[PDB]
RNA sequence: CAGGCGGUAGGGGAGCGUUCCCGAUGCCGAUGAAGGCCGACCCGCGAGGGCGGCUGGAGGUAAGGGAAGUGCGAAUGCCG
RNA sequence: CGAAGCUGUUGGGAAGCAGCGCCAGAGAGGGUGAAAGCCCCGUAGGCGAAAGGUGGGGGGAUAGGUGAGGGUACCCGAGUACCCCGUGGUUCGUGGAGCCAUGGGGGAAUCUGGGCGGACCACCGCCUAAGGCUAAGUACUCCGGGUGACCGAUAGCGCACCAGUACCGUGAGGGAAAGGUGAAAAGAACCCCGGGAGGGGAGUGAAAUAGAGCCUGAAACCGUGGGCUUACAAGCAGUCACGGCCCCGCAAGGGGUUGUGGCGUGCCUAUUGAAGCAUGAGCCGGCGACUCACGGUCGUGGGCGAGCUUAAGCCGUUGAG
RNA sequence: CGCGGGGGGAACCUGGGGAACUGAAACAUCUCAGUACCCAGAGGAGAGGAAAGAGAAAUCGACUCCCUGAGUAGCGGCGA
C-alpha cells in the first residue's frame, strides 16, 4: 500500500494554485548550440496539453 | 424509535458488481487490439506512455536530493488581520495559533490585507502595512533576542 | 456429556409418557441412559435358534433413558432432600423424601 | 417525575425549531452497528496454498486439458479467491453524532410516552418481581416496550432477565433496541453526559 | 402531444432472481418448513412471482432493508 | 447447589389450548417418542481445592548491596584506536561519505588524557570504547476455550467414517475413496420357491415407496407396459397454418399429435469476412474465476462547517463504552 | 566423581552461511532480498539492554513494543 510519491518529478514541477500542470521546459542548457551568432536566450516554462492531468497525481501525498 | 423500513436518505448505492450473467449488458470488458491484461495486469499506475510520456525534460532546481538532511530553520510564520480582529484582550500568539487554528512559528511576521484594531501583538518581525495600522493609529511590540 | 442421572430401584416410579401407571424400579445404566423396570411391554422376536425356550421370536422387556418418571410418597405430593447440621446422621445422608425426613 | 414527593418535569427546548434530519441520523448509526459484530473467516490460494506437489503434468499433449500449477483452483478443495478476510474492516465515527441522533428520536418518542424518574425505587432492588411491582404501580406491562440507565449494580444484579425491557446500568447506548420499544427513564442528565 | 425504439465492445436506469442480520423470549409451521412431480389460473414485458393439488419428512424466518466465496451450458476444465 | 402447575377432550403421539397457580442476583446452550422458562444437562451466584501433589503473589523475608568535603599526590579493559585496502550495515551502489565489524600490515596514548555535533585548523556541548550478566512491557502454536455474518462431511482440516492407509515409489516421493435406519433393531418369527444366494406371506412395526451402498432421493443412462406416429421416400427439424386423429369443459372450448402445405444454415469461441469439415463441445448433474487489505484518488444523503478531524494506550465493554 | 550435553520441540528468537526466477515492458549497476532457503546455540520467549547516546535545544537522560513523524530527509544508469 502506502504509495511513496516520486521525488524526481517533484524535484522540478509544481501545480500553480489553479491546479495547472506547469513547470520548466528544455533548451538553452548553456548553448549546446555554439554559433557565436545569436538565439539561445529564448527559454521559460510551460504546461502540458494532455499528459499534465496524469502527472499531478503521483504527488498527492507529498504535495 | 422503530424499524419503520429505515431504507436510506436519498442517494448512495452500494453498487456492487458480480461474476458473469446473461442479462442486460453483463459479460464483456472493453478494449481489444490492445493487449495488456496479465496475471499481474500492468497495475495500472499511469503506465503506457509509448513516448516517454513527454519525459524528455530534465531537472534544474538544484538545492535538494543531497542525502542525510534538508534545510534546518526555525519556523516562518506571517499572517492577516481579517482572521480574528474579533477577540484580543491581548493579541499574542500561543493564545492564538496555540488556539483557534494555525501552527508553530518560531519567528513572528504579520500582514494579510484587511483592517483591525491596532493592538499590540507579538511581533518577531512585521510589515510596514501594520506600522501605519498600528503606529499613529495602533500598537506593535518587539521580537525575541534571547 | 457426563455420567449424571438417577439411582437404584427401591420404588423409582413408572409414568405416562405414552404408557401410563406407576411401578417400582429394577435396573439402570447411564452411558446412553438406557435401563429397565418390567411394565414397558415390548417383545423382540428371536432368530433361527432353539437352545432357549425355542427357535425365533422373543418376549417381554422394558425400555427408556432420559427424564420421565418420579418417586414414592403416598397421599399429598413430593419434594426433595435437605441437609444435616446437628440432627441424626453426622452431616450426610439422603434417601428420597416427602418433605420432612421419610418417604 | 414521581407523584409521591416530586411532581413535574418538561423539556424539548434542545432545538424544537428544526428537527427534520432523519435521513443521515438512522443511516450512519446503522453502519457502526455492523462493525462490532465479529466477522472472522479466511481466504486461501494466492500463489501456492497447501505446498502443492509443486509443478507436475506434461504439456503439448497432457490429459488433453491444459495445466502446470498444482494449485488446481478447479475443485472443492483447491485455491479460489478472497471472499471474506478476517479483516472485517474497522470503520467508525464520533460523539459529535453519538448525540444528535437520539435527540430528535426520543423527542417524537415523547409524543409516545417517554418520562424517566431519573432514579426510582421498587423495593429490594435485588428481587426481580418487586421491581415490576413498581412497573404496575407506575403503569407499564409487557406490550409497547421500553428501556433505562441504572448506573448501579444494585438494580443490575437485580433486573436479571429484562425481556421487553431495558436493564442497563453502565453506559454504551442502545437506541436501536429502543426502536422495537418505546418509553424510558434516566440516571441524572449528568449520567447521560453533561 | 409530437417525438425516440436495430443496433458488438463501451457507457447510463433500475429493477429481478441468489446465501448470513435484527427484527427472532414477533410471526406460518405437521389442516406440513423444507425436496419435489404437476399445474394448461392469477400476478409479473422480464427477472421471475406466484398461486393452489398429490408424493414430501423436520423446521422456518415478516415489512424492511444491513451483509454479498452465486447469479455459471461449456475453456478437448475438476470430479462423480 | 441452584429456581417455579397442571388438565381433560381430541390427538400416533402431544412441547394443542383455554381457566387460570408458579421460583425467577439464576428464561445460556445440549436435550428426553409432533413448533417445550416452572422437565435430564446448565445459566446471577456465591461454597470450597487436596491427600495426593502441585504453578506461584502478597507478606515477612534471610546471607549477599547503600556519608561530605578539602589540598598532597603517581595510578585505570592494545596489536587495542587511528592510518591504511578490500568492507558490509546504515537511505548511503564511491560518492565532498563520517561512525559501526572491519579480513591485511601499520600502529599509539590512559584525564591538565580520551569519542561523536558526517573533510583539514582554529571556539563551544552531552558522553568515556576495546569485560561480560540482566528482568518487565515482545512473537509464537498442536492442542485446553471460547467464541467465532467459522465450513459445516463431492465442505471443511489430507482427514469428523481404523489415511497420511488402498495405492502408485526406487529413493525421496507421493497421495484416495469412504458421515447419516429409527423415538426404540425393537434388526425378521415362522411355513410353500429353494444351490447357499437371492422369493412370498406374517409379525414388530406411528412409518417396510421403513430393513441393513436401508434417511429423503432428483439427474445421464431403463423398459413393463400404455397412449398419439410409420415403410416414396430429402431433413438443425423446429415453427407457423386450415384439417383431421385418443383425455378433460353443458356449452365456450381446453388438450395431446401431425398430415400436407407453406417456413427453416443451428450453438459456444474470430474477425474486411461466417451456419459452415477452421476449434471446443462424452454425456447429465454437480465446482469454477477481480473481493480486499492497506495505500492513492472524481460522486453521493450528511454534519460540522474557517474551520472542519486525534493514534498507541488507561478505567471501563457479556455486551458497549 | 560432578554435573552439564549430543539427542527433543507447531510458529516466534540470536547468529553463521546465503540464491534465481521476476521488475527494470531487452540488459550488465540497481531490484526481488539479506527474502527463499541451509547450518548455528538458547528461551519461552528469545534476541536486547543501559550512553565513548541524541542532537542544538540555558536541552534530553538505559533497552524493547506501538503512536507518527515520513512516504519527509535522502538513496538511485537520480532510471525502476
Swiss-Prot record, chain A:
One GO CC term on file: cytosolic large ribosomal subunit
Name under which the protein is recorded: Large ribosomal subunit protein bL35
Keyword rRNA-binding among UniProt keywords: no
Superkingdom, taxonomy of origin: Bacteria
UniProt GO MF annotations: structural constituent of ribosome
Keyword terms: Ribonucleoprotein, Ribosomal protein
Stored PANTHER family: 54S RIBOSOMAL PROTEIN BL35M, LARGE RIBOSOMAL SUBUNIT PROTEIN BL35M
The organism of origin for this protein: Thermus thermophilus (strain ATCC BAA-163 / DSM 7039 / HB27)
Gene label: rpmI
Membership in a protein family: Belongs to the bacterial ribosomal protein bL35 family.
Keyword Nucleus: no
GO biological process assignments: translation
InterPro entries referenced in this protein's UniProt entry, alphabetically: Ribosomal_bL35 (IPR001706), Ribosomal_bL35-like (IPR021137), Ribosomal_bL35_CS (IPR018265), Ribosomal_bL35_sf (IPR037229)
Disulfide-bonded cysteines: none
Pfam families, A to Z: Ribosomal_L35p
Curated annotation (Swiss-Prot), chain B:
Database matches in InterPro entries: Ribosomal_uL15, Ribosomal_uL15/eL18, Ribosomal_uL15/eL18_sf, Ribosomal_uL15_bac-type, Ribosomal_uL15_CS
Pfam families assigned: Ribosomal_L27A (PF00828)
GO molecular function: rRNA binding; structural constituent of ribosome
GO terms of biological process kind: translation
Compositionally biased region (Basic residues): 26-35
Keywords: Ribonucleoprotein, Ribosomal protein, RNA-binding, rRNA-binding
Region named Disordered: 1-56
Gene3D superfamilies the record matches: 3.100.10.10
Biased composition, class Basic and acidic residues, residue ranges: 40-49
Gene Ontology CC: cytosolic large ribosomal subunit
Subunit and interaction comment: Part of the 50S ribosomal subunit.
Assigned protein family: Belongs to the universal ribosomal protein uL15 family.
Function according to Swiss-Prot or TrEMBL: Binds to the 23S rRNA.
The name this protein goes by in its record: Large ribosomal subunit protein uL15
Source organism phylogeny: Bacteria, Thermotogati, Deinococcota, Deinococci, Thermales
Gene coding for it: rplO
From Swiss-Prot, chain C:
Cysteine pairs bridged by disulfides in the record: none
Organism from which the protein derives: Thermus thermophilus (strain ATCC BAA-163 / DSM 7039 / HB27)
Keyword vocabulary terms for this entry: Ribonucleoprotein, Ribosomal protein, RNA-binding, rRNA-binding
UniProt entry tagged with the keyword Cell membrane: no
Protein name: Large ribosomal subunit protein uL24
GO molecular function: rRNA binding; structural constituent of ribosome
Protein's gene: rplX
CDD domains tied to this protein: KOW_RPL26
Main function: One of two assembly initiator proteins, it binds directly to the 5'-end of the 23S rRNA, where it nucleates assembly of the 50S subunit. One of the proteins that surrounds the polypeptide exit tunnel on the outside of the subunit.
One cellular-component annotation, GO: ribosome
HAMAP family assigned: Ribosomal_uL24_B (MF_01326_B)
Keyword RNA-binding: yes
GO BP: any one term: translation
Stored InterPro entries: KOW, Rib_uL2_dom2, Ribosomal_uL24, Ribosomal_uL24_CS, Ribosomal_uL24_KOW, Translation_prot_SH3-like_sf
Pfam families found in the cross-reference section: KOW, ribosomal_L24
Protein family (similarity comment): Belongs to the universal ribosomal protein uL24 family.
Gene3D superfamilies, sorted: 2.30.30.30
Subunit structure, as described in the record: Part of the 50S ribosomal subunit.
From Swiss-Prot, chain D:
Superkingdom of this protein's organism: Bacteria
GO process annotations (BP): translation
UniProt-recorded Gene Ontology molecular function terms: rRNA binding; structural constituent of ribosome
One Pfam entry name: Ribosomal_L4
Keywords for this protein: Ribonucleoprotein, Ribosomal protein, RNA-binding, rRNA-binding
Keyword RNA-binding belongs to the record: yes
GO CC, any one term: ribonucleoprotein complex
Coiled coil segments of this chain: none
Protein purpose: One of the primary rRNA binding proteins, this protein initially binds near the 5'-end of the 23S rRNA. It is important during the early stages of 50S assembly. It makes multiple contacts with different domains of the 23S rRNA in the assembled 50S subunit and ribosome. Forms part of the polypeptide exit tunnel.
Quaternary assembly: Part of the 50S ribosomal subunit.
Protein name stated in the entry: Large ribosomal subunit protein uL4
Organism: Thermus thermophilus (strain ATCC BAA-163 / DSM 7039 / HB27)
Source lineage: Bacteria, Thermotogati, Deinococcota, Deinococci, Thermales
Amino acid at each position: 500500500p502506502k504509495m511513496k510519491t516520486h521525488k524526481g518529478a517533484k524535484k522540478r514541477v509544481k501545480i500553480t494554485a489553479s491546479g495547472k500542470v506547469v513547470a520548466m521546459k528544455t533548451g538553452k542548457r548553456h548553448l549546446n548550440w555554439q554559433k557565436s551568432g545569436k538565439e539561445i536566450r529564448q527559454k521559460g516554462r510551460k504546461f502540458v496539453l494532455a499528459k499534465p492531468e496524469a502527472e499531478r497525481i503521483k504527488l498527492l501525498l507529498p504535495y | 424509535d422503530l424499524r419503520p423500513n429505515p431504507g436510506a436518505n436519498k442517494r448512495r448505492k452500494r453498487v456492487g458488481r458480480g461474476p458473469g450473467s446473461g442479462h442486460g449488458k453483463t459479460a464483456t470488458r472493453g478494449h481489444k487490439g490492445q493487449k495488456s491484461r496479465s496475471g499481474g495486469l500492468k497495475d495500472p499506475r499511469r503506465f503506457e506512455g509509448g513516448r516517454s510520456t513527454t519525459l524528455m525534460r530534465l531537472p534544474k532546481r538544484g538545492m535538494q536530493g543531497q542525502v542525510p538532511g534538508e534545510i534546518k530553520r526555525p519556523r516562518y510564520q506571517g499572517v492577516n488581520l481579517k482572521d480574528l480582529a474579533r477577540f484580543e484582550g491581548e493579541v499574542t500568539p500561543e493564545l492564538l495559533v496555540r488556539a483557534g487554528l494555525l501552527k508553530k512559528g518560531y519567528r513572528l511576521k504579520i500582514l494579510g490585507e484587511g483592517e483591525a484594531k491596532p493592538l499590540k501583538v507579538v511581533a518577531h518581525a512585521f510589515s510596514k502595512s501594520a506600522l501605519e495600522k498600528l503606529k499613529a493609529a495602533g500598537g506593535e511590540p518587539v521580537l525575541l533576542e534571547a | 456429556m457426563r455420567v449424571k442421572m438417577h439411582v437404584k430401584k427401591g420404588d423409582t416410579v413408572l409414568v405416562a409418557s405414552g404408557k401410563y401407571k406407576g411401578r417400582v424400579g429394577k435396573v439402570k445404566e447411564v452411558l446412553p441412559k438406557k435401563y429397565a423396570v418390567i411394565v414397558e411391554g415390548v417383545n423382540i422376536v428371536k432368530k433361527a435358534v432353539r437352545v432357549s425356550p425355542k427357535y425365533p421370536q422373543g418376549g417381554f422387556i422394558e425400555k427408556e433413558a432420559p427424564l420421565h418418571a418420579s418417586k414414592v410418597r403416598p397421599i399429598c405430593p413430593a419434594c426433595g432432600k435437605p441437609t444435616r447440621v446437628r440432627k441424626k446422621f453426622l452431616e450426610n445422608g439422603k434417601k428420597i423424601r416427602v418433605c420432612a425426613k421419610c418417604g | 417525575i414521581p407523584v409521591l414527593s416530586p411532581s413535574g418535569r418538561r423539556e424539548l427546548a434542545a432545538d424544537l425549531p428544526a428537527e427534520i434530519n432523519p435521513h443521515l441520523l438512522w443511516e450512519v448509526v446503522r453502519w457502526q452497528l455492523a462493525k462490532r459484530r465479529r466477522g472472522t473467516a479466511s481466504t486461501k490460494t494466492r500463489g501456492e496454498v497447501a505446498y502443492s506437489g509443486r509443478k507436475i503434468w506434461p504439456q503439448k499433449h497432457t490429459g488433453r486439458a491444459r495445466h502446470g500449477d498444482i494449485g488446481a483452483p478447479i475443485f472443492v478443495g483447491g485455491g479460489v479467491v478472497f471472499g471474506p478476510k478476517p479483516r472485517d474492516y474497522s470503520y467508525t465515527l464520533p460523539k459529535k453524532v453519538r448525540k444528535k441522533g437520539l435527540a430528535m428520536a426520543v423527542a417524537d418518542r415523547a409524543r409516545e410516552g417517554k418520562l424517566l424518574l431519573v432514579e426510582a425505587f421498587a423495593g429490594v432492588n435485588g428481587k426481580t418481581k418487586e421491581f415490576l411491582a413498581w412497573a404496575k404501580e407506575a403503569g407499564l406491562d409487557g406490550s409497547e416496550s421500553v428501556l433505562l440507565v441504572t448506573g448501579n449494580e444494585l438494580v443490575r444484579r437485580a433486573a436479571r432477565n429484562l425481556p421487553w425491557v431495558v436493564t442497563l446500568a453502565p453506559e454504551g447506548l442502545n437506541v436501536y433496541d429502543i426502536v422495537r420499544t418505546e418509553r424510558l427513564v434516566m440516571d441524572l442528565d449528568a449520567w447521560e453526559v453533561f
